[PDB]
Each structure stands twice: as C-alpha cells, then as structure tokens.
Design a protein around this motif. Structure first.
Motif, PDB file in Angstrom:
ATOM      1  N   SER A 199       0.877  -1.146  -0.051  1.00 46.16           N
ATOM      2  CA  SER A 199      -0.159  -0.363  -0.230  1.00 46.16           C
ATOM      3  C   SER A 199       0.695   1.176  -0.409  1.00 46.16           C
ATOM      4  O   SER A 199       0.237   1.864  -0.413  1.00 46.16           O
ATOM      5  N   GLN A 206      -2.297   8.590   0.410  1.00 47.00           N
ATOM      6  CA  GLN A 206      -2.283   8.187   1.775  1.00 47.00           C
ATOM      7  C   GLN A 206      -2.512   6.505   2.026  1.00 47.00           C
ATOM      8  O   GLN A 206      -3.785   6.099   1.317  1.00 47.00           O
ATOM      9  N   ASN A 262      -3.186   2.213   3.081  1.00 44.25           N
ATOM     10  CA  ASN A 262      -3.767   2.052   4.585  1.00 44.25           C
ATOM     11  C   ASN A 262      -3.928   1.837   5.832  1.00 44.25           C
ATOM     12  O   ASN A 262      -3.088   1.183   5.711  1.00 44.25           O
ATOM     13  N   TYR A 263      -4.448   2.383   6.029  1.00 39.98           N
ATOM     14  CA  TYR A 263      -3.971   2.456   7.837  1.00 39.98           C
ATOM     15  C   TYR A 263      -4.615   2.189   8.334  1.00 39.98           C
ATOM     16  O   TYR A 263      -5.138   1.779   9.640  1.00 39.98           O
ATOM     17  N   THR A 264      -5.167   0.923   7.799  1.00 40.56           N
ATOM     18  CA  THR A 264      -6.414  -0.166   8.873  1.00 40.56           C
ATOM     19  C   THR A 264      -5.179  -0.169  10.332  1.00 40.56           C
ATOM     20  O   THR A 264      -4.259  -1.100  10.018  1.00 40.56           O
ATOM     21  N   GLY A 265      -6.039  -0.893  11.175  1.00 37.97           N
ATOM     22  CA  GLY A 265      -5.431  -1.454  12.005  1.00 37.97           C
ATOM     23  C   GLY A 265      -5.269  -0.253  12.618  1.00 37.97           C
ATOM     24  O   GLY A 265      -4.600  -0.731  13.961  1.00 37.97           O
ATOM     25  N   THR A 266      -5.119   0.482  12.354  1.00 39.73           N
ATOM     26  CA  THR A 266      -4.120   1.788  13.352  1.00 39.73           C
ATOM     27  C   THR A 266      -5.565   2.841  13.038  1.00 39.73           C
ATOM     28  O   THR A 266      -6.332   3.562  12.959  1.00 39.73           O
ATOM     29  N   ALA A 289      -8.124   4.267  10.647  1.00 42.09           N
ATOM     30  CA  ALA A 289      -8.547   3.264   9.471  1.00 42.09           C
ATOM     31  C   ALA A 289      -9.983   4.506   9.037  1.00 42.09           C
ATOM     32  O   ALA A 289     -10.027   5.231  10.021  1.00 42.09           O
ATOM     33  N   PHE A 290     -10.571   4.252   8.056  1.00 42.92           N
ATOM     34  CA  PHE A 290     -11.606   4.934   8.180  1.00 42.92           C
ATOM     35  C   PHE A 290     -12.754   4.538   7.994  1.00 42.92           C
ATOM     36  O   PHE A 290     -12.957   3.439   8.742  1.00 42.92           O
ATOM     37  N   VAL A 291     -13.540   5.419   9.043  1.00 41.24           N
ATOM     38  CA  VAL A 291     -14.473   5.324   9.345  1.00 41.24           C
ATOM     39  C   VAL A 291     -16.348   5.786   8.872  1.00 41.24           C
ATOM     40  O   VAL A 291     -15.437   6.760   8.435  1.00 41.24           O
ATOM     41  N   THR A 292     -16.688   4.750   8.665  1.00 37.25           N
ATOM     42  CA  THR A 292     -18.215   5.340   7.958  1.00 37.25           C
ATOM     43  C   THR A 292     -18.989   5.734   8.594  1.00 37.25           C
ATOM     44  O   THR A 292     -19.369   6.016   9.663  1.00 37.25           O
TER      45      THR A 292
END
Ligand SMILES: CCCCCCCCCCCCCCCCCC(=O)OC[C@H](COP(=O)([O-])OCC(O)COP(=O)([O-])OC[C@@H](COC(=O)CCCCCCCCCCCCCCCCC)OC(=O)CCCCCCCCCCCCCCCCC)OC(=O)CCCCCCCCCCCCCCCCC
Lengths: 69, 61
Positions: free
Chosen positions: A2, A38, A40-44, A47-50
C-alpha cells in the motif's frame, strides 16, 4: 505494498512499459486539487470510519408553546 | 512426420540453455526436444497490454 504510489503500482505489474517518471505530459491527468497519498491505515487510528452523509429523512418538530388568550 | 509433431527446440518459445550446457542437456535429457517452460521475456507480453499502439486506431467492428 500500500505504500507504493499509483502509477508505479501499474508499471510494477507490467501494465505499461513507460513509467510515470517518463510518461509524457498529455497522458498525465490534470488536477484542480492537490495530491495527497495516504496508505491503508487499517489496524491504526487512521482507519476509515464510515458514516451517513445524509440526515434523518423524517424531520421532527421543535416544540414551541402558545397561550390561550 | 505427422501434422501434430514432434517439433524441435529452436521453434519453441521458451528460455533454454546456451553453449556447452546445451550439449550437456541434449546428452542428459530423456527427450531433448523438451523445454524448460519459462517464457522468453523480450517477446511474451510485450508490448505491455496498457501500451499497445493498436488501441488508438481501433474502431468498433
Ligand atoms: C556446499 C553447498 C555448495 C552448493 C553450491 C554449488 C555451486 C556450484 O558448484 O556451481 C557449479 C557450477 C554449476 O553450474 P551453473 O553455473 O550454476 O549453471 C548455470 C548455467 O547457465 C546452466 O545452464 P542451464 O540453465 O541451461 O542448466 C543446464 C543444466 C541441465 O541439467 C541437466 O539437464 C542434467 C540433468 C541432471 C543430471 C543428473 C546427473 C547427476 O545443467 C547444469 O546446470 C548442471 C547440473 C549438474 O558448475 C558446474 O557445472 C559443476 C557441476 C557439478
């Protein structure tokens, strides 16, 4: 992976023979807005909030009172 | 021969051996006709599908 910027993610992958560094000018998309890459900030925390871009369809009434004159 | 082979190595589009190693392979091979199966980089998938010239002249058939 990413962390790989676009263009390269496609050259790296044999999608094209010409890199974004050497691709000509007219083939570059025009941007009225600044670039900002930017990953993939997953796990941090980033992370994208919907969320819902809308508001409730049925708007209720905000009370106000009258007197019996 | 028949209409379906056998065919030699210099017509198969695979990455083979070169030099004394080819003589050794044709010696130590059950069937020297056979290929390694690795494609030839200059040819296979070149030019890349996202850079084919033929897309600018293309028209709906
Ligand atoms: C302790 C650990 C040390 C391990 C490292 C050893 C490295 C070493 O000694 O290199 C020797 C080196 C190995 O050859 P190479 O440089 O790596 O081969 C590269 C060629 O491009 C090879 O060209 P190729 O890709 O077409 O392959 C030809 C291949 C084809 O091999 C065959 O088809 C023969 C089939 C196997 C026969 C088995 C008989 C045993 O023959 C060989 O490579 C030699 C196989 C023996 O030299 C020798 O051939 C000595 C052989 C013993």
């Amino acid at each position: 992976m990413s962390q790989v910027e676009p263009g390269w993610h496609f050259w790296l992958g044999y999608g094209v023979d010409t890199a974004p560094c050497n691709t000509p000018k007219e083939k570059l998309p025009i941007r009225a807005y600044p670039y900002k890459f930017q990953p993939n900030y997953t796990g941090t925390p980033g992370a994208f909030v919907t969320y819902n871009t809308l508001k409730p369809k049925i708007s209720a009434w905000e009370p106000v009172t009258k007197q019996r004159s | 021969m028949l209409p379906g082979g056998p065919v030699p190595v210099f017509k198969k589009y695979t990455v083979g051996s070169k030099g004394i190693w080819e003589k050794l392979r044709v010696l130590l091979a059950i069937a020297p006709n056979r290929s390694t199966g690795n494609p030839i980089v200059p040819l296979y998938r070149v030019p890349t599908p996202g850079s084919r010239p033929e897309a600018n002249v293309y028209q709906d058939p």
